[PDB]
Structure 1
Amino acid sequence: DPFTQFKQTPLPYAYDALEGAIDAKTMEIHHSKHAAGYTANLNKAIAGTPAEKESIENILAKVSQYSDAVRNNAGGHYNHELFWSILTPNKGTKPSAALQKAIDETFGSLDALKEKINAAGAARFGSGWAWLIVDNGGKLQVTSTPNQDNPLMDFTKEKGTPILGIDVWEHAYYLRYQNKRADYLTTIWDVINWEEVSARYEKALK
């Protein structure tokens, strides 16, 4: 049906393509059950409200005006859509020259950035997400959020445009890693698509 407000973008890889870090079963359930449910519930939650024809960014920017169902499913849809786009089976991507320079000046090195993201992800108690954002000063920042909340939401304290998010809900890693979230965080870097992260950074600065 072309007329639904929100859709899942087709995945640019197979469910078993990311086995360097994420098992195939997780990819399939995570995409076709969890994430698909956020999209369907978002379409339902916005129906008949002022969010009905708004962009996802605009819904998040005014999210406190809407029901909790809009919040949780708008976050869910946005976050997962971003997450799929920043994974890849192709090894060895790296930040653009401009992103690399910004990472080095802000954190020291790519390793130092990964350490900070890993630590933020580990420190998120319960369900949530780790983020790399561009703030309203054009500055890079590492944050985390609970549940499906994100740095675009009106009430979020550390606001900015996400260029990278890593899912630390237990559903994202339990089948392969069980309690070992830190091993998931260490390993996921092998499938992060730094070309996509870099394209998002370019747009955030414009």
Structure 2
Amino acid sequence: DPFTQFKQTPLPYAYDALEGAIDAKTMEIHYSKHAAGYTANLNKAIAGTPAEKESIENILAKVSQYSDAVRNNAGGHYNHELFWSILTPNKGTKPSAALQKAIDETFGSLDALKEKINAAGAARFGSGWAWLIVDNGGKLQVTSTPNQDNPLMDFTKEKGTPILGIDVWEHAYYLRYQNKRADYLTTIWDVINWEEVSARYEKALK
């Protein structure tokens, strides 16, 4: 149906494409059950409200005006859409010159950034997300959020434009890693698409 307000973007690789870090069964369920549900429930939650014809970014920026169903599903739809875009089967991507310079000046090195994101992801108690965001004015920051909340939402304390998000809900890693969230975090770097992260950085700075 072309007329639904929000749609999932088709995955740009096969479910088994990310097997260097994420099992195929998880990819299938995570995309076709969890993420699909957020999209469908978002379209239902906004129907008949002032969010009905708003962009996802505008819904998130005003999300406290709306129901909890709008918050949770707007978050879930945005977050998962971003997540698929920042994964790739193509090994060896790296930050753009501009992003690498910013990472090095702000954290010291790519390894230092990864360590900070790993720690943020590990420290998120319960369900949530780890993020790299660009704050207003352009500074990179690492944060985490609960459940499907994100850095675009009006009440989130550390606000900014996400350029990388990593899902630390247990559904994202339990089939392959069970309790070992730290091993998921260490391994997922092998499938992070730094070209997409860099494109999002470029767009955030405009």
**Cα distance, 1:84 vs. partner?**
0.1
Q: Which digits, 9 at most, give the CA deviation of each residue in 1:154-200, with x for residues without a partner? A: 00000000000000000000000000000000000000000000000
**Hey, what does 1:24 align to over in structure 2?**
24
SS at match of 2:175: helix
Q: Which digits, 9 at most, give the CA deviation of each residue in 1:128-152, with x for residues without a partner? A: 0000000012000000000000000
Q: Which digits, 9 at most, give the CA deviation of each residue in 1:42-86, with x for residues without a partner? A: 000000000000000000000000000000000000000000000
SS at match of 2:121: helix
Q: Percent identity?
A: 100
TM-score (norm 1): 1.00
**Cα distance, 1:113 vs. partner?**
0.0
- What is the count of residue pairs matched by the alignment? 206
Q: Which digits, 9 at most, give the CA deviation of each residue in 1:26-45, with x for residues without a partner? A: 00000000000000000000
**Cα distance, 1:19 vs. partner?**
0.2
Q: Distance in 2 between matches of 1:59 and 1:162?
A: 15
Report the RMSD for the aligned CA atoms in angstroms.
0.2
**Hey, what does 2:118 align to over in structure 1?**
118
Q: Distance in 1 between matches of 2:173 and 2:63?
A: 28
Q: Distance in 1 between matches of 2:122 and 2:93?
A: 24
Q: Distance in 1 between matches of 2:88 and 2:6?
A: 23
Structure 2 alignment gaps of length 5 or more: none
Q: Distance in 2 between matches of 1:12 and 1:154?
A: 30
Divergent runs of 4+, >2 A: none
